Assembly symmetry: D2
Homo-oligomer: 286 residues x 4
């Protein structure tokens, strides 16, 4: 009986869903953490049957969704909730959605878990290049995309079993430049990859828990489209990557499933590339 | 059905055996390519049942073939080795010949493990290594991967997968990892990228390398017991303090060889309890 | 006539001073940016002759200090000055010390400059390991140590000549784990090294200006001592680095001087290690 | 006074010449080691004054010596090359002999440049490279650095400095950089670390490598005009859009060889207008 918390699903078109689907093949029970502004729309669509085909694994298997909870990675505890958000129409009907509140809820309802997925990012100035990003904009990217991972580990470690495992998602813009990946998103991914190492040291030594990050190639997710640098990145990857196949969210999903299992017990602190090999190339091969 | 060729098993104390065990768990059929210096004894020990405890999960060894990755084709075999005591009776042990042999008996296969290394002057530091010694390390430990690819690629299906084993001394200095071995592993990790480009584009085949932590194998023990220090250091300082097992590398190998890793290629994946991530002893 | 702005000197015991000294050999005119809480003590010591021996370059040369200005890397513009700090006894007697204010002052007094040094870091929670660092603590480290570099470039680019050059200082904890380098300092250095690349792209393409970072080995600076992980790091480096010599601030200084000159015109976006080789080692060589 | 040996100049269109020019600016005395296939023509062109325009900053060429980094000692020279048309008249061109020669004429020196590479099968992709071709690339382009170190180290002062040149195809795939050249540069960058450990500890000598961007040298032009594409791509996409000059590498070389870089060792330093930092064309 394995339980995974996946923080960062808003629809069926991102990596978090692909990860949920692949874990389900292994009979892992899934809890979704859903950003409060899209929580109700998600629930409506789910209730309305919009995701029913998206949920099919096998001839014999539906995805087993244990729960779906509102989850906001910008707040650590109840003390951090600011009053404008406390009053926002979308947040008003929701409760216990800070990082600590959701660990407590999960623990109270289901007991201890053994897999944790961070699958989320935000950067209010993602559309500006780094040089024109404000302090507020930069720190928001770091806060939502990088620090949220450390906070998640801090609060969830207490409700996890020994030999538990943690993954996050990153992008290669942290290491090589991608013009257009703005707003301090590149900086936040670099911090996330570095933090994955430091966290692996503390979590390995103090709890025997492992943490890794998957550097994913491009996927036409809601976040990607909102940034169409994405249609370009996808076309580029499909022309130039060693592997010509379309990169699927379930390609990242099956890697995540492995990293989250005991089959990878001797892997920790690593950035694992799942991108059809594209990261290895220097120049276009024209 | 999955068929894997493992080049580089001589006993049950190395990474090749741990990889065999884990692949057998997943019901993949295993063919061993065994270096002629140890071929007769491995066979004998197996027949005489000494590996019975070691095969307990039981393993499905399809075939056990003499194999010497120094030789690309039968024409490369020098007269001396051809006439040598351990080679004289044996046939079809070159890279081209074992590939041809395997294809003839079993058809196309889908998994290839390179799990071997050799270097005449491993006990000399790099600065004191001869041209002959350095090139011997590159020939046996790096070029052997390229040639294995070249020949096995024609008897492998699309979507097949290749792994080798490497060591972090390619990237950070390990005094004692001598004879051009550090150089050979740096070349192997770089070649893993270039191969991944050619194999992916032309054959839809994947190739990755596992950077393993220390294990007290036959090879490791022979190198003038830095190995027991290496192990002790890893168990004291790695983020993860469990004993590193051969089957720990084996389960990551199984993953990389399987269709679960279809979007991973050209990568060096560290299976080392995280030791590689540390800068300074945390004393 | 070359002018360099060095932001981050508090005394003669850090890297900024070593950099100032080596630039002075090349007859570059130096402006110091000095954190306001230590500005007056610095000035007093300077006036009192405390640094006179520290200032000697040659038999023939004193260091040419063009000006010394209060400079606070936590504030971008006059609008950002918060009222508690506006009232702090040390800030009360000082003005025009935000990043934009000091670029304007330098420009007004001396015209355009051609070298810029970022030599500063802070992290209010540096003493906590990463897992126990708060959001506030983490974002403070990123704000003062990482974002300050982007802000400096944004405001100083307008007062720089073409073919100008920029360096910052980093540490290898960004890339490999150093227990004790807490507070999100590791994360901030990782962001700084990544940002150095992204900035090099924008600054190279839009202004023909270069930017690099020096990854320095350990030096017994005020900041290092305040963290004695430092006495240990220094002893370790001196036993285990390829090069056995004591690492001097002027060893980093002479590298900085080169990176800031036209002799390195084809180098940009790089992390250059100046650490006696220590970064290349895997295990102690006992 | 500073004395530098530059191994790998055959003309004025390569990195070796650009390095010579910049070192001469700093009044270092330059000795050239010139490969015998081009030795007579280089000498002739120099004597006949064709390099007069090229030497304008004027340069201080101390000596010009035939040198073949394939040979560690006189005993390594095969009878065929010893008797060959271009080698037959020449003496003292092995690594040990040029070191001995230099020491005898000039005493100890303080600077060494490795600026050479060679590979029989550079035009073949890696997968199609023979064992002989791959090992030839490693021998000439990587091992030559180790051996140069071994011998020059005894005729170098403490605090001396060594550089080689490398290319980013060691780290990221460049289709067309064939024949084991990518492998050779990965080995050279790794060996630069191991050497830095041994040389630093035992001799207080530094060693670093420069990863240069593209330059239309004789060597580059011979490889079946990817070079003109490489250059055009670099000038369109690098953060810095200036033409990359030979003397741009030369001024970084001068820095690394000088006491200004005394705390830098084991490093691969990119001098490439920043091209290496990019992931995707910014189109
Ligand atoms: N799509 C790609 O091409 C790609 C490539 C590499 C890495 N990634 C990474 O994968 C991860 C998932 O993104 P995706 O592309 O699947 O897009 P997505 O739009 O499916 O998921 C991003 C999720 O983050 C959530 N989120 C935003 N702010 C939040 C907050 N304050 N608190 C809690 N949740 C919040 C959003 O609701 C959204 O569901 C991200 O870390 C992203 O950086 C994506
Ligand atoms: N033991 C470790 O700690 C360790 C760590 C990292 C990497 N590795 C790597 O793992 C791989 C296996 O090493 P091991 O430690 O398990 O040693 P091992 O002694 O168990 O296996 C090496 C095998 O290579 C075979 N071999 C050598 N030359 C051959 C040739 N020319 N043709 C065919 N076979 C040949 C030998 O018979 C031997 O069985 C190597 O690539 C090694 O560098 C080992
Ligand atoms: N000392 C080392 O061992 C070492 C090693 C590697 C990197 N570094 C880096 O070198 C740089 C300089 O540090 P140092 O070791 O010379 O110490 P230092 O104490 O000499 O200098 C740090 C300076 O930063 C200033 N500062 C702090 N907060 C500021 C703010 N909000 N605004 C403006 N200035 C502020 C301080 O006044 C201080 O003068 C830092 O970036 C540090 O991370 C140091
Ligand atoms: N041209 C480029 O774009 C470029 C880019 C990156 C790196 N490099 C590297 O720079 C170095 C110099 O290359 P270049 O492009 O200036 O070419 P080049 O043709 O100017 O110089 C290479 C020299 O090596 C000499 N040489 C070859 N084999 C030798 C041997 N066995 N002994 C003695 N000398 C020998 C040749 O005579 C030749 O002068 C090489 O290490 C090369 O890989 C070149
Ligand atoms: O981290 C990502 C990385 C990519 C890679 C493709 C790409 C898109 C846009 C610009 C450059 C590259 C797509 C989507 C990603 O997720 C993001 C990006 C930005 C933001 Cl604000 C949020 C999220 Cl979830
Ligand atoms: O690549 C290896 C790496 C290690 C771990 C590190 C180590 C052990 C002993 C001395 C130095 C370093 C052990 C065995 C390894 O396999 C080798 C090494 C050298 C040789 Cl000649 C052959 C083999 Cl199979
Ligand atoms: O970035 C640095 C890096 C070191 C390396 C040596 C070291 C000291 C303490 C813990 C670990 C390593 C020393 C000082 C450094 O400067 C710092 C560190 C922390 C802070 Cl809050 C400020 C500054 Cl200027
Ligand atoms: O190492 C080099 C790197 C380049 C730049 C990249 C390049 C040029 C032409 C084809 C492919 C790649 C040019 C020349 C280089 O020197 C070489 C390459 C191969 C050989 Cl056999 C000899 C030399 Cl000197």
């Amino acid at each position: 009986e394995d339980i995974c918390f996946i923080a960062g699903i808003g629809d069926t078109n991102g990596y978090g869903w692909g990860i949920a689907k692949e874990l389900s093949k292994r009979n892992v029970k899934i809890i979704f953490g859903i950003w409060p502004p899209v929580y109700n729309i998600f629930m409506k669509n789910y209730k309305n049957g919009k995701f029913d085909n998206d949920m099919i694994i096998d001839k014999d298997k539906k995805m087993n969704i244990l729960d779906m909870l509102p989850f906001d990675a910008s707040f650590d505890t109840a003390n951090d909730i600011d009053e404008e958000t406390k009053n926002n129409k979308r947040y008003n009907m929701l409760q216990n959605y800070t990082i600590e509140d959701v660990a407590n809820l999960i623990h109270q309802k289901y007991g201890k878990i053994n897999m944790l997925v961070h699958s989320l990012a935000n950067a209010k100035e993602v559309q500006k290049d780094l040089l024109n990003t404000s302090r507020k904009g930069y720190l928001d990217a770091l806060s939502k995309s990088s620090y949220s991972l450390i906070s998640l580990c801090k609060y969830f470690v207490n409700i996890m079993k020994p030999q538990s495992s943690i993954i996050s998602l990153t992008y290669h813009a942290s290491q090589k430049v991608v013009p257009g990946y703005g707003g301090g998103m590149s900086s936040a991914k670099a911090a996330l990859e570095s933090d994955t190492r430091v966290l692996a040291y503390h979590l390995g030594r103090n709890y025997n828990i492992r943490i890794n990050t998957i550097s994913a190639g491009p996927l036409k997710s809601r976040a990607a489209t909102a940034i169409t640098f994405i249609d370009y990145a996808i076309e580029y990857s499909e022309k130039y990557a060693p592997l010509r196949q379309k990169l699927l969210s379930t390609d990242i999903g099956s890697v995540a499933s492995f990293l989250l299992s005991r089959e990878s017990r001797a892997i920790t602190g690593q950035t694992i590339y799942v991108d059809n090999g594209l990261n290895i190339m220097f120049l276009p091969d024209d």
